[PDB]
Amino acid sequence: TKKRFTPPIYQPKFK
Amino acid sequence: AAPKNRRTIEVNRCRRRNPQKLIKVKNNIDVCPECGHLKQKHVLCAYCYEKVCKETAEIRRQIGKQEGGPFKAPTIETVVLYTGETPSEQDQGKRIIERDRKRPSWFTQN
Amino acid sequence: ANFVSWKSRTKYTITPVKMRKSGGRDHTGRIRVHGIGGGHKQRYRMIDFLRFRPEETKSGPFEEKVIQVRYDPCRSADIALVAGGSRKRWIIATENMQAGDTILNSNHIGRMAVAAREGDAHPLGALPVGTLINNVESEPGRGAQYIRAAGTCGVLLRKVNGTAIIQLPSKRQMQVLETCVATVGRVSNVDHNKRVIGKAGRNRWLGKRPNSGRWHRKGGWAGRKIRPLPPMKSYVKLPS
RNA sequence: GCUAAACCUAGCCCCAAACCCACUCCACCUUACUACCAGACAACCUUAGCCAAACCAUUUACCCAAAUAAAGUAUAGGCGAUAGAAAUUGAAACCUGGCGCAAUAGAUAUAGUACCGCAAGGGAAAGAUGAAAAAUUAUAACCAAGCAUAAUAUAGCAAGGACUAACCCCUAUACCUUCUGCAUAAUGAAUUAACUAGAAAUAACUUUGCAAGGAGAGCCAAAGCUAAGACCCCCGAAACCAGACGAGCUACCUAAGAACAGCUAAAAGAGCACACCCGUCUAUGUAGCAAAAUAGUGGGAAGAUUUAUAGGUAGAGGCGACAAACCUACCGAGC
RNA sequence: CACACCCAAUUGGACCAAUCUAUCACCCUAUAGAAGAACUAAUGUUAGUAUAAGUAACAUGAAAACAUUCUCCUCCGCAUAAGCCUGCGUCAGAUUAAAACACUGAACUGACAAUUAACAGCCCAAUAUCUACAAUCAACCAACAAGUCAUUAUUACCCUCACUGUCAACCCAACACAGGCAUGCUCAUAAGGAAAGGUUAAAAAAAGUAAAAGGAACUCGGCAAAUCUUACCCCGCCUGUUUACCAAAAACAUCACCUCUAGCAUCACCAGUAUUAGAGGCACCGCCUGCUGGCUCCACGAGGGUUCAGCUGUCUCUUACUUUUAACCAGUGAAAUUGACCUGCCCGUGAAGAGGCGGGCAUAACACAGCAAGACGAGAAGACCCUAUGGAGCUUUAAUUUAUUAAUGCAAACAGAAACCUGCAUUAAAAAUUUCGGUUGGGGCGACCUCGGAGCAGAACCCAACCUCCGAGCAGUACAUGCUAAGACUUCACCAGUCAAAGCGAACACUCAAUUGAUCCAAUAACUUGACCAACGGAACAAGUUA
Ligand SMILES: [K+]
Ligand SMILES: [K+]
Ligand SMILES: [Mg+2]
Ligand SMILES: [Mg+2]
Ligand SMILES: [Mg+2]
Ligand SMILES: [Mg+2]
Ligand SMILES: [Mg+2]
Ligand SMILES: [Mg+2]
Ligand SMILES: [Mg+2]
Ligand SMILES: [Mg+2]
Ligand SMILES: [Mg+2]
Ligand SMILES: [Mg+2]
Ligand SMILES: [Mg+2]
Ligand SMILES: [Mg+2]
Ligand SMILES: [Mg+2]
Ligand SMILES: [Mg+2]
Ligand SMILES: [Mg+2]
Ligand SMILES: [Mg+2]
Ligand SMILES: [Mg+2]
Ligand SMILES: [Mg+2]
Ligand SMILES: [Mg+2]
Ligand SMILES: [Mg+2]
Ligand SMILES: [Mg+2]
Ligand SMILES: [Mg+2]
Ligand SMILES: [Mg+2]
Ligand SMILES: [Mg+2]
Ligand SMILES: [Mg+2]
Ligand SMILES: [Mg+2]
Ligand SMILES: [Mg+2]
Ligand SMILES: [Mg+2]
Ligand SMILES: [Mg+2]
Ligand SMILES: [Mg+2]
Ligand SMILES: [Mg+2]
Ligand SMILES: [Mg+2]
Ligand SMILES: [Mg+2]
Ligand SMILES: [Mg+2]
Ligand SMILES: [Mg+2]
Ligand SMILES: [Mg+2]
Ligand SMILES: [Mg+2]
Ligand SMILES: [Mg+2]
Ligand SMILES: [Mg+2]
Ligand SMILES: [Mg+2]
Ligand SMILES: [Mg+2]
Ligand SMILES: [Mg+2]
Ligand SMILES: [Mg+2]
Ligand SMILES: [Mg+2]
Ligand SMILES: [Mg+2]
Ligand SMILES: [Mg+2]
Ligand SMILES: [Mg+2]
Ligand SMILES: [Mg+2]
Ligand SMILES: [Mg+2]
Ligand SMILES: [Mg+2]
Ligand SMILES: [Mg+2]
Ligand SMILES: [Mg+2]
Ligand SMILES: [Mg+2]
Ligand SMILES: [Mg+2]
Ligand SMILES: [Mg+2]
Ligand SMILES: [Mg+2]
Ligand SMILES: [Mg+2]
Ligand SMILES: [Mg+2]
Ligand SMILES: [Mg+2]
Ligand SMILES: [Zn+2]
């Protein structure tokens, strides 16, 4: 039950 | 709730091109007797309404130059005068507004 | 770490010197002593623990007049400002010391003992047996290091062949030369141990931080485990 | 007919050859790129571990200066996995080449730039007319999915047999993978284009050469020997170790500062109650204003308080009023 | 009439797309050689575009001469510090997306312009020598936590105002983000602003207001709301502290008490010295007790229960109105999801819960708004065991170690003696590496793992695991229980095991159902011997626990 957090992935801005 | 399957274009055309979605043709359009521009039966002519507002703004600009500031509304009637006109018999004791322009034909002096 | 000790002054002065706290950190910057940090700022007042220090132009026994006995933040006991000749210096005050009193500092050892007065500094070879003493030194010219705390006092148990037995406040005997200079009587603030902190806030005023919250099952006897011998290993625990 | 689709260079890869670069002026180890004052600080020290032994604990290949051969031999080794010589032998050696790549390829590179991260560090995307742009009256036609042209008529894996005829009739339980057995309501796939996965030894076999001999020293041979052909994949952990980088968030500490109305009270880790700090309950919100907020209601609010600035402690650790808390939005061991 | 032309894994073939090379060929081919040599599938990579969907969501106070004025809000504003670095000044632009708009369009592009030191920053000749007495209106008084501000002597020296910061609607949060953000003033403004794009007034949802009669009958619970309200029990002395992002507590800390360790200095402890310091337990005080333990009790608590009274739409039983949302019109325009769908109902069947299969019934086609029964609806998290000769944290009388550190010993060395250092041993400390063998739904407690026999496959052989039951891990007689050697059996492989004529040599293949253990290694002159290696085809030596 350990708290698992997945940070959001920011795509490169050039797209 | 997420879609279980992708809706096909054939299904989409029946919804997008349904007669309700389509724009309804208007049958209330008629030509203005004065200028000939298009108008609706229950709506004032756009061309004829614009010419009144153009003249109204010029008249209201002349009022501002006479009052010379806010909170100076006159307690008497107002008369709009053009070039080549004189105050009338009933236009006595009123605020005459001079306009350096010929009187418009649609504007009838009263 | 770029740690420089504040103890850089090389000339003695009665002026309170500003000192910077350590927080239990050594020169490396890591904690070496726990529970130390914060508290009210203090200025260190240098204490001359060598009572018999004759002036440059003088020698032999000399006298000092007490100017003021005041509070010292650094130490438990109080301190006294004394003036001897043309100089002033801080010393550790005794239980009975007032402003105006005259203390005597000598290095003379007479054939017979002398009337010991509280606050005076005489060698251990000229003090009567049993008299309470404080601020003793291991050897001559070493300076007082023992029996400094408030109310502490030693006992001159015996004197044989130029050496004397000093009973420390921890009830331990110590043998030092009879030429060591000691102060007669107890130290000031006798009722220092009778104080009540009152609240946890006052302990943070003295620069002491709360103890760790970990439940330490380890201790003097609990943590250290006697290894059972193979014959005794069978009898260590019996089901009941 | 729109969106688009096509193109050939830029340059690169592997070799050969030959041993490479760095003072125009000014500034640059202090807070680098900062004209201009007493320093004394000084460098050197076995790698480890993953992995193999189907665990693991001894052990486990890593150019050390001549290709070949001796030879995988002598030796070494939980005498297991595996490791492994030497004496001795002894060859050629002419850069300007390609059954190398051609914009998702070839270097990451149009550039270590944009951008991301406090830092160490990570790391792109793309260009295309013609001899002439001082011809733009251009650079025809046709091609993915997606659309438009052109919404739909009972009924059903969407098809097949058909039929005069789209449908109507009859027949038919999607694909892959994993299990004894999948229409399975088990796994995977919106779709299009491009890219993306079987590398090698002994022996044997097959086809030539020569033959008690074979082979361009060494090696094998009781028909062998020499040469060729023909057999052994891809993605994915949590981890471990080494060396760096991080305390501008947070934990605690150091230095020197700042803040706390009014009222009741009293020289109070006192009460009420703003600023401020905290986050009890409820509701909203749940790709939200917000990778933790909003409204109301609450705890503290002269103290073990709150807070700005600079410094310190760094991962076999730090720090901790112990919550296995925190150490830059995944800390039972950071990146 | 034709005939190689309907199996998984695997195996044997015959052909072969495209490409490069050799040689041909010359509207795209041939024979060979070579290889980055063929994609309906890896929650594949990159890119394009669909689906959800023109949906969610987003925005501009009113009139007007666009002078101005009006309505409303202000929990804000101005400045400095820090940070940022030209980021709504002017002009022009084929301009044209800031989440709407836009001609002057402009928080876009290009050019031009700018912030001027008095404020702030950037300071100081040497050597000695000086500096006991807070602050708080500092005067009373009263303290402890003991504090935030000073020179002189001599020598040297009389040149002068440089340099840098100065803008803005601004910073940290991927954004023009309802968040974060130090200080001085204003404490309601003299400054700064706009909640409504337009319309309609459905449901559902959110916030708010009002309510007959009743007043907790609601509910796990008086949660919310209303009102401004009494009495206790449990736990914790109290203020305080903690899981930043689900736990604020009864947990931690805390005075007080108690235990343990230490007789001393030049970097922590400490510029200290047992009335001290450190490591800990417990949680004040008071009472009682042993020679350490138990109750009581003041306040206190967003702790956990209980209760009087009141209060109330919590409820009997809901209703009305307002605002946001909503729906429609205009502008802008996402995301999870998605095998293909031409996507009905009832029984039956079926990897057992059918829109798709069987049998019946129903059925023109299409939007829009609701609903949440189904599509074992979608995303992510987690539970549940199990598996891995997969990890990690922790603990220890798991195994393996002392390199390291400390204390000693002897050697070395000095030496009229002693130390330091070094080498080698011996304890201890603190650590280091590594592992948790299987079987019995799970756990506990026990049993089990090899070999022989029976129930046990009635008749060649083999074969019923689990299960039920009884055994074996010997002993005895020999001492040719010597040496050799045809042919066979074989526990379904191998290893191992079994029988054996003849012959030499002697005499005149021992009994027994099982009665057993490989290799390496060790010992030995040789012979030969060595393991409840019983987990019995055996790892040289490794436990427990994880909520
Ligand atoms: K392993
Ligand atoms: K509480
Ligand atoms: Mg304590
Ligand atoms: Mg404790
Ligand atoms: Mg292994
Ligand atoms: Mg393992
Ligand atoms: Mg490339
Ligand atoms: Mg690239
Ligand atoms: Mg097409
Ligand atoms: Mg049909
Ligand atoms: Mg289905
Ligand atoms: Mg299934
Ligand atoms: Mg899928
Ligand atoms: Mg290891
Ligand atoms: Mg491992
Ligand atoms: Mg900090
Ligand atoms: Mg208070
Ligand atoms: Mg209060
Ligand atoms: Mg804390
Ligand atoms: Mg705990
Ligand atoms: Mg725990
Ligand atoms: Mg982190
Ligand atoms: Mg046939
Ligand atoms: Mg070919
Ligand atoms: Mg390929
Ligand atoms: Mg393809
Ligand atoms: Mg694919
Ligand atoms: Mg919808
Ligand atoms: Mg909407
Ligand atoms: Mg608005
Ligand atoms: Mg100035
Ligand atoms: Mg204003
Ligand atoms: Mg409205
Ligand atoms: Mg609206
Ligand atoms: Mg009512
Ligand atoms: Mg009830
Ligand atoms: Mg309430
Ligand atoms: Mg408490
Ligand atoms: Mg109290
Ligand atoms: Mg509290
Ligand atoms: Mg929390
Ligand atoms: Mg907190
Ligand atoms: Mg909470
Ligand atoms: Mg406690
Ligand atoms: Mg009740
Ligand atoms: Mg009641
Ligand atoms: Mg009503
Ligand atoms: Mg719209
Ligand atoms: Mg999408
Ligand atoms: Mg249908
Ligand atoms: Mg059914
Ligand atoms: Mg049917
Ligand atoms: Mg539903
Ligand atoms: Mg689901
Ligand atoms: Mg296994
Ligand atoms: Mg473990
Ligand atoms: Mg056999
Ligand atoms: Mg075994
Ligand atoms: Mg076995
Ligand atoms: Mg067997
Ligand atoms: Mg627990
Ligand atoms: Zn008209």
Numbering used by the authors:
A (entry chain d): 37 to 51
B (entry chain 0): 79 to 188
C (entry chain D): 61 to 300
Publication text:
Human mitochondrial ribosomes (mitoribosomes) are responsible for the synthesis of 13 oxidative phosphorylation (OXPHOS) proteins, encoded by the mitochondrial genome. They represent the key steps in the late stages of mt-LSU maturation, during which functionally important regions of the rRNA progressively mature.
Binding of the NSUN4–MTERF4 dimer to the immature, but compositionally complete mt-LSU, sequesters the flexibly disposed H68–H71 region to expose the active site and allow access of factors that modify the rRNA and check its conformation. The MTERF4 protein folds into a bent α-solenoid that binds with its convex region to the surface of the immature subunit and exposes its positively charged concave region towards the outside, where we observe a segment of double-helical RNA bound. The most prominent rRNA rearrangement involves the PTC loop, which in state A surprisingly forms a helix with the P loop of the 16S rRNA. We conclude that formation of a stable NSUN4–MTERF4 heterodimer is critical for their function in mitoribosome assembly.
